[PDB]
Amino acid sequence: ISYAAYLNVAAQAIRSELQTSVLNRSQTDAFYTQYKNASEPTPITK
Amino acid sequence: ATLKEVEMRLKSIKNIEKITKTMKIVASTRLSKAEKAKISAKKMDEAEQLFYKNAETKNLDPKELIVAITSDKGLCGSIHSQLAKAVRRHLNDQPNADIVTIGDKIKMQLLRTHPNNIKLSINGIGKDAPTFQESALIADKLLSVMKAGTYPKISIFYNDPVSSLSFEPSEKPIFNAKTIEQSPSFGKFEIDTDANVPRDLFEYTLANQMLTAMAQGYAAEISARRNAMDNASKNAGDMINRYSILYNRTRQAVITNELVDIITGASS
Amino acid sequence: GEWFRDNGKHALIVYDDLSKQAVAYRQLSLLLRRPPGREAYPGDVFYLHSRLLERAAKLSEKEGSGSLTALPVIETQGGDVSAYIPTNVISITDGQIFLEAELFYKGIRPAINVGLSVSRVGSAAQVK
């Protein structure tokens, strides 16, 4: 858990009809993938 | 030469002419969000860096974390070209470093020049305008799986839109918990020595400075994609019309040659 | 090559170049004043290569299992298989090895195009 996470949660709460852009920042598609000497472990989502 | 090959070749270029022009509009109509999120980020950037200025924070006196900021989408120009060189060229001085790459089209040049340096890569991000949640999560992994807090120096590489027709590879520093409280003019600000403020300040400036870098990074890109595809639709013009003439030069020659055999075989 | 086929032996005949044979036959017909067909070629230009290639075959066991393998060679202009003569011979042979000039200079030799080349006989006459 990170401090940026302690803030992310709150930013999701303020999604509470006329919420235009606003919906583009509500979610995102992210896939991180480690790497080795290049080789790379299994790609998971955020 | 073929009756048809010059027609279906004219088709795979006639529709390529509109497609590059249809994405030029997408990039040109999306420049509005680009020129806004750019100013919003920068304004928060000033608000965020003013503390780092009045506190006179600077890197301590061989690890360093490098973050590459670009997209996975091509058709944008030399934005993935010049930025990757700026990184490589900065990497030459200090080979001792780990590189986290955001976007795959930046992972390209780095896999070639310095394949082992890449210890982490983010996939499928550069398509929309960046968001805090996106960056805050990238920093959360950067902090966890990479342990950025154990690094003496952080460097974010991004693209800065100097002009609306040209971009500019740039670099910004991120200072860790230890570098913040050990700042010369850090006592200048009253801070309770218990609520781990310096620690929370780094984990928070890690996400923001990324978004600020992304905002300008994906803004300089959209501004470069419009340019990249305005030259494309124009270049598709010297094709749709060039081969257009060649189609007719073939159509007239088809009707004549098709008619000669008839007249020749009618004389008997 | 038929003598070998007729006598339990195996002959392999290569026609090169066939495109030039038709060229010649067009000369005969046009000077004899026989009406021209497509591309000036005589009307029975398909029959010209049909009766020729069919002669190449594998006889039965009662006849001596003698065979005759034909490897016709045709020349195309501008890589246009859609031409008249090329199409004729194509519909005759039980196969086709199409050599492209682009693949030739690019390194692949022989410049066989896997996509356009096929052998209707297939594994039937291949090493197990």
**Structural domain boundaries in chain B:** 1-25+229-268, 26-228
Which residues have C-beta within 8 Å of that of residue A36, sequence separation ≥ 6? none
Nearest to B148 by CA among A11, A3, A45: A3
Q: How far away is chain A from the Cα of B131, in angstroms, using its nearest Cα?
A: 5
B246 and chain A in contact, CB less than 8 A: no
Alpha-carbon gap, residue B259 to B206, rounded angstroms: 76
Query: Does CATH place domain B1-25+229-268 in 1.10.1060.10?
Result: no
- Looking at the 3D structure of chain A, how many domains does it have? 1
For chain A, the C-alpha Rg in angstroms (whole number) is: 15
Beta bridge partners of B174: B154
Question: How many secondary structure helices (H) and strands (E) does chain A include?
Answer: 1, 2
Within chain B, where are the H helices? Answer: 5-28, 31-54, 79-93, 107-113, 132-144, 177-181, 197-235, 237-240, 242-264
Question: Which of C80, C81, C84 to mutate: most B Cβ within 10 Å?
Answer: C80
For chain B, the C-alpha Rg in angstroms (whole number) is: 27
Beta-carbon count within 10 A of C3 CB: 10
Question: How many secondary structure helices (H) and strands (E) does chain C include?
Answer: 5, 4
Task: Say how far residue C94 (Cα) sits from the centre of its chain.
Answer: 9
Phi/psi at B98 (nearest 5 deg)?
A: -110, 140
Over the range A4-37, which residues count as b (16 or more CB within 10 Å of their CB) and which as e? bbebbeeeeeeeeeeeeeeeebeebebebbbbee
Starting at the edge strand found earlier in the chain, the sheet holding A44-45 runs A44-45, A31-34, B118-123, B98-102, B65-69, B154-159, B169-174
Which residues have C-beta within 8 Å of that of residue C93, sequence separation ≥ 6? C53, C70, C72
CB contact under 8 Å between B261 and C78, yes or no, is: no
Torsion of CA B175, B122, B141, B201, to 10 degrees: 30
Give the domain range for residue A2. 1-46
Alpha-carbon gap, residue B206 to A2, rounded angstroms: 11
Nearest to B131 among A2, A28, A35 (CB): A28
- A46: which chain B residues are within 8 Å (Cβ-Cβ)? 137-138, 141
Question: Resolution to 1 decimal, in Å?
Answer: 3.6
B256 and chain C in contact, CB less than 8 A: no
Active site residue C120: yes
CB B142 within 8 A of CB B121: no
CB contact under 8 Å between A30 and B124, yes or no, is: yes
Which stretch of DSSP H or E encloses residue C69? strand C67-70
The CA-atom distances, in angstroms, between B114 and each of A31, B109, B140, B236 are 22, 8, 25, 37
Nearest to B132 among A2, A11, A43 (CB): A11
CB B13 within 8 A of CB B239: yes
User: What experiment produced this structure?
Assistant: X-ray
Nearest to B167 by CA among B89, B223, B122: B223
The DSSP-derived string for B68-97 is: EE--S---S-THHHHHHHHHHHHHHH--S-
Alpha-carbon gap, residue B204 to B198, rounded angstroms: 10
The CA-atom distances, in angstroms, between B213 and each of B106, B216, B229, C20, C94 are 15, 6, 24, 69, 64
Alpha-carbon gap, residue C39 to C46, rounded angstroms: 13
Over the range B131-144, which residues count as b (16 or more CB within 10 Å of their CB) and which as e? bbbbbbbbbbbbbe
- C86: which chain B residues are within 8 Å (Cβ-Cβ)? none
Query: What's the CATH code of the domain at A40?
Result: 1.10.1620.20
CB contact under 8 Å between B1 and C40, yes or no, is: no
Alpha-carbon gap, residue C122 to C112, rounded angstroms: 16
B26-228 adopts what CATH topology? Pyruvate Kinase; Chain: A, domain 1 (3.40.1380)
CB B177 within 8 A of CB B198: yes
Using DSSP, state whether A26 is helix, strand or coil: coil
